[PDB]
Write a protein that binds this DNA or RNA. Structure first.
Lengths: 260, 207, 125
RNA sequence: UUGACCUCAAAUCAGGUAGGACUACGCGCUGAACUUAAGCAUAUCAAUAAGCGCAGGAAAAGAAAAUAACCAUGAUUCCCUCAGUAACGGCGAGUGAAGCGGGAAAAGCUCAAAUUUGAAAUCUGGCAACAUUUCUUUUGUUGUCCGAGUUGUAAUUUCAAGAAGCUGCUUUGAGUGUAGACGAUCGGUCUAAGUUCCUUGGAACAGGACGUCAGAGAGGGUGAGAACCCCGUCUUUGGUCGAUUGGAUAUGCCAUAUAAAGCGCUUUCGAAGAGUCGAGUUGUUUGGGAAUGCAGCUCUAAAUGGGUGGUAAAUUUCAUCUAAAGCUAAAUAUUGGCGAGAGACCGAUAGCGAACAAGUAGAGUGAUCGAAAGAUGAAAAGAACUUUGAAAAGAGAGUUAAAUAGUACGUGAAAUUGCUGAAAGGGAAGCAUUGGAAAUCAGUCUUACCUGGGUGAGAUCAGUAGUGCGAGACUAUGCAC
RNA sequence: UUUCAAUGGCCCGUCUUGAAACACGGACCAAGGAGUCUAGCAUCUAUGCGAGUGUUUGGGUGAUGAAAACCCAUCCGCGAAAUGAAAGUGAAUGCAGGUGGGAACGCCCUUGUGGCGUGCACCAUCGACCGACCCGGAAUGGAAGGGUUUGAGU
RNA sequence: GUAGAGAUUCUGACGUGCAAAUCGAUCUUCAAAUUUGGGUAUAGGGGCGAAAGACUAAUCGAACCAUCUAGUAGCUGGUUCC
RNA sequence: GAGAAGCUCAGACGAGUAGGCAGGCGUGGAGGUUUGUGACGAAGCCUUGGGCGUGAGCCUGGGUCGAACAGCCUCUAGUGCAGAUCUUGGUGGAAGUAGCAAAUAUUCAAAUGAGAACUUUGAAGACUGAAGUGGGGAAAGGUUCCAUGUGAACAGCAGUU
RNA sequence: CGAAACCACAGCCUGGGGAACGGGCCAGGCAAAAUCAGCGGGGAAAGAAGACCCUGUUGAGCUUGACUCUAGUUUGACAUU
RNA sequence: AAACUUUCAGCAACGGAUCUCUUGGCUCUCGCAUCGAUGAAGAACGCAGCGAAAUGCGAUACGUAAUGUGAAUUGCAGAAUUCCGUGAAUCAUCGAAUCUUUGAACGCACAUUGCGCCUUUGGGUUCUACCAAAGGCAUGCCUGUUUGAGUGUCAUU
C-alpha cells in the first residue's frame, strides 16, 4: 500500500473562478517552484493517486478443505499418468516406470553425488539438465525485487522419513523434496498444470493409501475423508459409442458430407 | 436511493472507521510466538506438568448444564476431603478456588476422586535431595513431563443404552404432567394467598 | 540456498553493504587467489591483497603481466601494479587499476601479521 | 529568669527530589463544527478533531458490595461467538451492549479495624569499623549516639478467614571443585569446487569442448548471463568472561538447624473502611428504557446491616456479594525510537516533500509555506602537439569498441527550427472516390516428384528361396549375376 | 507516395427538441489523468459436500529454513419448524390426499395433429394438518365440535 | 502665501504604466482640533473608528496561518481500445 | 481425419443516440511451459520500404542503439486519452513586432586597449544653485568600503568600466 | 537589445436557408507573389465560470412582538446561619 | 523563373520523452526498551595542511585514553620518526575522559557577550579599593541540623 499521507502533506486551497485558472486546489506562498501549483488531485503532479491502495485488501483466499483434498488427489492421479508428465514438459522418455518408486535406502542418502548418481541410474537426470539449461534472467522488473532468475521445474521427490535425503537432493536445481504427509498442490500442479514428475520412496508409496484412503474406506490420517466418486464410470466415450450394443440400436450412419 | 431488491442496508460505517481497522497479517507470527513462549515455559518448569490439574464443573445454564467442563480451582471442602491443605495445594500444583462451593455430593466426590488420582500419579521431589520426607517420593529417577489431561481428562456424562419398560412409565402422562406443573407453578401463589385471606376473613367474622 | 535468518538475500542490502563497507571490510573484500605452488605450500586458497605482493594478471587486456602491487586503492577497489600503465595525451604514465579477483599472488609479503594470519587460518608456513 | 511541649519561621545548613523532551500504543479532563437526516432545532458526525494534565515497555484493569436462577459458575485482560441481538432513536435518519459457551494466558495477595503491656520488641540520620560490586562509580551489615514514634512504629490476624484457647502428631542454606551445559561468545574457523582449450568480443562473466564441488546452484562484486575469480552461502567444534546450586549424590563439605511452623476435637468470641452508602434535583453521558455511569447542590444512614437480582411504589420471602483502603506478572495494543528479515508494491512528473550536501535553496513580520535537480566512459584514457583567432573558440590531429559517448556527456521521441532535395500554390488548408503522370516495391515459376530419352560406371532388384507353428509385414544372409 | 483533374466533404467534444454556429472548452507537443478497495445485500453462474455444511478463534508436526502447505478437538454461525405482542402451543384421515394441463416411458392401433396406462417438474384449483383470531362451552386444563378468516407454515 | 501636510478639477498624461494608484498643471491648508520620528497599549464576532461598514501589513459587511477536510453540492465540466 | 470447442449443407437478415450483452486487440507484474530471442547486438527510437487483420493492432526490410526481452496456458492490476478555462515540463504564430522618448547637453583632442559614444586625462559648453544632484547622521542593509586583476553571467545599448 | 495579450482552423463580398444577422453550407459576384505607414467597419475582437433576473430545500451582513436558546439581570427557596 | 508559404524525407538544431538500471521510497513481519538538574531534546559559535555544505567533534575540537584488525588516506600532497614493528587508517570497536555559549536553565537580566554578591588563592604600594584564576549564589517540596518567634500551655526560682 502507498503511504496514507501521500499527496496530503501540503496546504493547498482552490482559488475559485475569476483567476482564469482551473479550480483545482493550488499551493500558496511564494518564492519557490511549488508555489501556485496544483495539488491533491490524481491528475496533478505530486498529488494523491486515485483510490490509494489499502492494506486491508483481501489478500488471502479460503477454499473448502474437501476441495483442497480433491485437487491434491487429482494432482496425484495426474502425476501417475505418463502422458500428462510429457505434456507438462518433464523429460520422462527413458523412465522405467510411472509412478517411479525407489528403494528406501534413498532416504539415507548423504551426498548430492549419490542423489545425482541415483537420478542418472533411474534416467531422471534429463529433467535436471533441462532445468539447468532453461535457467535465465527474468524479463521485467522482478530482477529489482529479488526475483532475478527463472527456471523450469524438475522432479518432486516424496519421502516418508528424513535421514539425509532432503539435504542430498536440495542443491540439485529443479528438485523439490516433500514429505508424503504434507503433499502440496503448488508442487504437485505447479502453475495450475497437472502432471508433475514425482519420484516416490517405498515407504511413502506404501503410506499413500493411509494418507488418501479410498472411496469406500476412510483414510486413517484424514478423519472421515473418502476419495471422490467420478460422475462417469468409463471415460472411454469413444469405445462406448463404437461398442456393439450402441451401434446395434442406432439409426443409419448418415452422410458426413453432402453434395451441393 | 433504494431501488434494488434485497434487505435494506444497515452498514455501521458513519464514523472514521478506517483509522481503527485491525488487520491479521501477524496471525502466523503470533501463533509462532505463543508456541515458542509455551515451549520456553515447558523447558523452564520441567519436569512439572505444563497445565495444572483442573476440576470438573457443570456450566450454569440450562443450555449447558448437561455438559462437563474444566473449572478454575478445587474448593476447600474438596481439598479437606482429599486430605490436602490449602497451603500445600499451591506448592504441589493444585489450584484453590475459595469462591466455588460444593452444593451436591456428586460434584464433591467427582472432584475428590480427581485430586486422589492426581496425588497417586504425582511424584514429589524431596526438599533435600536423598532425604525423602513425609509425602516425598523415593523413586524420582524416572520423572518426566506428562500431560495432566492424558491421565486425568474431563469426562462427559454417559447415557443409558437401554432399560426395561416399567408400568409406571406406561401410566405416566408426560404432556399432562408438564401442563399441570406449569399451571401449578404460576397459580400456587394465588391459591396460597386465597387460603390465607379466607382464613383471615373467617377469623375476623368469628371475632 | 541460504537458511540463516541473519543472512540477507536482498540485492539492495547486499549492494549497499558492498559499496558502503569501510576500509577494514574492504581489505577482506579485495582478496586474490594464491598460485598453485602457494596453495600447496600454505594450504590456503586465497588471502586479502597487500602492498609489496608479487602478482600476475589473469584477465583483461593486460593478461600475463607480472608485477608487484605498488598501492591498494580501497576507495575504488583497485590495485596499482608496477609497470602497468597507459600513455596519456602528453606522454605521462597513468597506472591502470586491476581488480583483486583478477590477479593471482605468486609471492607473499611475509611479516609477523601475515604469518600469524596464515597460521590462524590453518596453513603451513 | 529558665526549660519542656505545641504551632510557625529563617539558613548558599546536611542529604535528596520535581520540572523539560519524546505521544505509535496508554490513563484522564475539556471539547466542536463540517456532514447525514435529501430542509432543520433533538439526534448523527462524536462521548471524535483541536486544546490541557500524566506513565511505561507496555499502560490500564484485576482477585467480586461479580454472574446467574442453573445438576449452578467463579480475579483481570484479549480473540471467536453471543449480535447488527436485547435495547436506544423527530421509534425519523441512525445508534447499539451484556450473561452463558469455545480459546490464549493463568497467581495470588496486602493494610485499618485486637492490649506486647512481664518491658517500641519498630524505623531514619550522623560517626566509626567490616564487607560487597557490571563498578575505587554499586549495595549492605555491625556497634554507638541523636532523632522519629505511645495523637501508635513492630508481631499473629484481612472474613477464603482468624484470635483466645484445648489435646497428639513431624523438625533445615550457603562458600569450593568436576562432568554435562548456557548468555555473551570470537584466538577464529578443517570449513568445497576451472579462472584449462577454441570462436566472437575492447573486456568472457557469452557460445562450444573437457572437467570439479555441492549439508554450499541464496545474494552481491569483478571491463557483458559466473556454483567452482572474490566476498559470501551450507555444514560444523572449540580457546575465553559471566549468570555459576541454572541443575545432578552439584558431590565436596562450612554450620545451616533446638524451637518457629504442622494438622486434629471442643467451645467462647469473631474488631471488617461515613458527608460514605442511600434518597431527591440538576447537567452530562450510556443500548440502560419512571436515571447506565460521572459530577454540582440539599437531606443524610444502619448492623443479619448494606449493595445487586435491568419497570416506578409498599409489603413478605429467596439467591448472590461484602463497597466507601492498597499491590500484583502472563495472554493484549504499538503510523514514536532502535535493530533485523522480506514483498505478485513504485522504477525519477512514480515511490516519503526529499534516490542528488532536503525540511536544503527560496517566500512571508510572523504563525507557517516549501521546491527543482539521478545515469559520459570498463578505465579520464577528460583531447598532447601544429595552425587561425585579441579571446571565446574553430580546423587539423590524438584517446576509446564507440566522440552517432567531449563533461551543454547512457539512448535521445514529439512540439518547434535551419540547410539540402522533391512537389504544389489566382482570397485558406486539410479529406474521400476514380484515374493519369512521376518515383518506388514484390512476384525467380522452367525449384522438387515423374514420362520418353543420347554417354557413363556400378557391393544388382522384384519374382524365388533358406533363415517362434497357420498367415500379412519387415532386418540380415546364399541363388537369381 | 506525391501531385493533378472531376465530384462530394462546415470544427471536434458537450448541454440540448435543435450546433457549423454570432453557445461553451480547445495555440502546440511529451509525460501524468478519472467506477477503485472494503463491510453488507440481491440475482445469475461455477465448484465441493449435502440434512448437513463451514480446517485457518485456536492447537501440532516446529528445529530444521517454514507468514506457505498439511493435520487436529470442543464450541459456535447458517439450515433442518412455524406461529403469536406475549404467556404459550407446535405440522399424516388417505399412496403425505383429490382434480386439470403436463416431461419421460410402456401397450394397442394402423399411419392421423394417433387411442389406453401411469404419471417427474411447474402452474391453477378443492381439501387435510400446525400457530394466531373469532366461537359454541360441550380453582385449575383446553380435549373432541366449529368458522365467513389470518401466517413470511407442513 | 514658502517648507511641510493633503488631493478639487483638467473626469489631462499613463492606463500589458516609472508606478498592483504614479506624473504634470491647477487646487485646499499652512502656528494649531497642526505635522511627524522612536517607545508603548488595545487582536478577530475582537480591536479601533471627528462614523466611510471605514482601518486592522496590496487581504475587511468579520484579517492571516494550520487543522477538522479529499467538508456537502438535486449544479457545471470531464470520464481513456476494437 | 480435418484443434467434435471439429467437419458439412441450406435459408433469411444487417440504421442506430442513452443503454445492455458477447467475443477480441494492447500495457505493467506473478506461476507453469517454449535444448524460446540476444553483445555475430535485447529493449527503445527513426523510416521518403514490404506484408496481415473489417478493426483494436501485429510481423518484417533499412538506419541508430547498447543489455536485457518474448510466444503459449493461467493469475493479477495504480492497465489504453483530444478535450476536463485538466497537472507538470518544453516549445510556437504574434515578431526581429510593441517598445528601450519624464528629470535642458553635450563637443574636441590625447592615453589605454584587438575592439572607445559610454574607461581615464586635458580643454570647452552646461546643470544641481545652500529647503542642492553639496557635507553628515537615525532606522534599515552587511562588506556594498579600499587596493590589485577579470570582463563567463548582471549593468533590458555597450564596455577597456 | 527585445516582449506580452490573444490563438479550434482561419480570414474578400451579396442573397438564401439555418440555434431566426455565416469566413466555411447552397447559388452568385469574383479571384495573381512578397511588402510599408496609418486606420478604427467587422472578426456578434480581448479581459472575468454576468455584479442585473430566476433556480438551489447553497450562504453571509443586518433587523424584529419569527422558532429554539443564551451571557447578563430580577425574585424566591435551601445551605453558609 | 526566382523569392515566399505549405507537405514529406535526409542531416544539423531545441527539448528531454521512451527503454534499461537504482546505496531510494512505500508496505508487511520479527525482535528490543535505553532521554533529562551527575544538566535532555533543540539552538548558536568554532575545530582539519589546503574545507562553505553534509557527517563527526568541542579550546584535549573530522578529536584524547583503552581494545581489535593489520599498511594505509587519497584530489594534491605531506609523512619512510614504516613493516619481524603494542603500528597507517575520516578503519572497526569502545567500559576511561574532554565536552565552548546556550537551552527545563538555575545569581539578576538580555534587541545589552549588560549588572551583581560569597569563599579561597595569586599580581600590581594596597590588613578594606582594582585585576586574574578556581569553587559557588534559582524556585517548590521531603527527612534531619542549627538559630529563632508567639499576651498558645505548663515549675522550682
Amino acid at each position: 500500500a502507498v503511504s496514507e499521507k501521500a499527496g496530503h502533506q501540503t496546504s493547498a486551497e482552490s482559488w475559485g473562478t475569476g483567476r482564469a485558472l482551473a479550480r483545482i486546489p493550488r499551493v500558496g506562498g511564494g518564492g519557490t517552484h511549488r508555489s501556485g501549483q496544483a495539488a491533491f488531485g490524481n491528475m496533478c503532479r505530486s498529488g494523491r493517486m486515485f483510490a490509494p491502495t489499502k492494506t486491508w485488501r483481501k489478500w488471502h483466499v479460503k477454499v473448502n478443505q474437501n476441495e483442497k483434498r480433491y485437487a491434491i488427489s487429482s494432482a496425484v492421479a495426474a502425476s501417475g499418468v505418463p502422458s500428462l508428465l510429457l505434456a507438462r514438459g518433464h523429460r520422462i522418455e527413458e523412465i522405467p516406470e510411472v509412478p517411479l518408486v525407489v528403494d528406501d535406502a534413498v532416504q539415507s542418502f548423504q551426498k548430492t553425488k549419490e542423489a545425482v548418481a541415483l537420478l542418472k541410474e533411474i534416467k531422471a537426470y534429463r529433467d535436471v539438465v533441462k532445468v539447468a539449461n532453461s535457467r535465465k534472467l527474468r524479463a521485467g522488473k522482478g530482477k529489482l525485487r529479488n526475483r532475478r532468475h527463472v527456471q523450469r521445474r524438475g522432479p518432486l521427490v516424496v519421502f516418508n522419513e528424513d535421514a539425509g535425503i532432503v539435504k542430498a537432493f536440495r542443491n540439485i536445481p529443479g528438485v523439490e523434496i516433500v514429505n508424503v504427509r504434507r503433499l502440496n498442490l503448488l508442487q504437485l500442479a505447479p502453475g495450475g498444470h497437472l502432471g508433475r514428475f514425482v519420484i516416490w520412496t517405498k515407504s511413502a508409496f506404501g503410506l499413500l493409501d493411509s494418507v488418501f484412503g479410498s472411496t469406500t474406506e476412510a483414510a486413517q490420517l484424514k478423519k472421515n475423508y473418502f476419495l471422490p466418486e467420478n460422475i462417469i464410470s468409463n471415460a472411454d466415450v469413444t469405445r462406448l459409442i463404437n461398442s456393439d450394443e450402441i451401434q446395434s440400436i442406432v439409426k443409419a450412419a448418415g452422410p458426413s458430407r453432402v453434395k451441393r | 436511493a433504494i431501488h434494488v431488491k434485497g434487505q435494506l442496508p444497515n452498514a455501521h460505517f458513519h464514523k472514521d472507521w478506517q483509522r481503527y481497522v485491525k488487520t491479521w497479517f501477524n496471525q502466523p507470527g503470533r501463533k509462532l510466538r505463543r508456541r515458542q513462549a509455551r515451549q520456553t515455559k515447558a523447558a523452564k518448569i520441567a519436569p512439572r506438568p505444563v497445565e495444572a490439574i483442573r476440576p470438573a464443573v457443570k456450566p450454569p445454564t440450562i443450555r449447558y448444564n448437561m455438559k462437563v467442563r474444566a473449572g478454575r480451582g478445587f474448593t476447600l471442602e474438596e481439598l479437606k476431603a482429599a486430605g490436602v491443605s490449602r497451603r500445600v495445594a499451591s506448592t504441589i500444583g493444585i489450584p484453590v478456588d475459595h469462591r466455588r462451593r460444593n452444593r451436591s455430593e456428586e460434584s464433591l466426590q467427582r472432584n475428590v476422586e480427581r485430586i486422589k488420582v492426581y496425588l497417586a500419579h504425582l511424584i514429589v521431589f524431596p526438599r533435600k535431595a536423598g532425604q525423602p520426607k513425609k509425602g516425598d517420593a523415593t523413586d524420582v529417577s524416572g520423572a518426566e513431563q506428562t500431560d495432566v489431561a492424558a491421565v486425568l481428562p474431563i469426562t462427559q456424562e454417559a447415557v443409558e443404552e437401554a432399560k426395561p419398560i416399567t408400568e409406571e412409565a406406561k401410566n405416566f402422562n408426560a404432556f399432562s404432567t408438564l401442563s399441570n406443573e406449569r399451571a401449578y407453578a404460576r397459580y400456587a401463589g394465588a391459591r396460597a394467598a386465597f387460603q390465607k385471606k379466607r382464613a383471615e376473613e373467617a377469623e375476623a367474622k368469628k371475632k | 540456498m541460504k537458511f540463516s535468518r541473519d543472512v540477507t538475500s536482498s540485492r539492495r542490502k547486499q549492494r549497499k553493504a558492498h559499496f558502503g563497507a569501510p576500509s577494514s571490510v574492504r581489505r577482506v573484500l579485495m582478496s586474490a587467489p594464491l598460485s598453485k605452488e602457494l596453495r600447496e605450500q600454505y594450504k590456503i586458497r586465497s588471502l586479502p591483497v597487500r602492498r609489496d605482493d608479487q602478482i600476475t594478471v589473469i584477465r583483461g587486456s593486460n593478461k600475463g603481466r607480472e608485477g608487484k602491487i605498488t598501492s591498494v586503492y580501497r576507495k575504488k577497489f583497485l590495485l596499482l601494479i608496477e609497470r602497468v600503465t597507459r600513455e596519456k595525451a602528453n606522454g605521462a604514465s597513468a597506472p591502470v587499476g586491476i581488480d583483486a579477483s583478477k590477479v593471482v599472488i605468486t609471492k607473499l609479503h611475509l611479516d609477523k601479521d601475515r604469518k600469524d594470519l596464515i597460521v590462524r587460518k590453518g596453513g603451513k608456513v
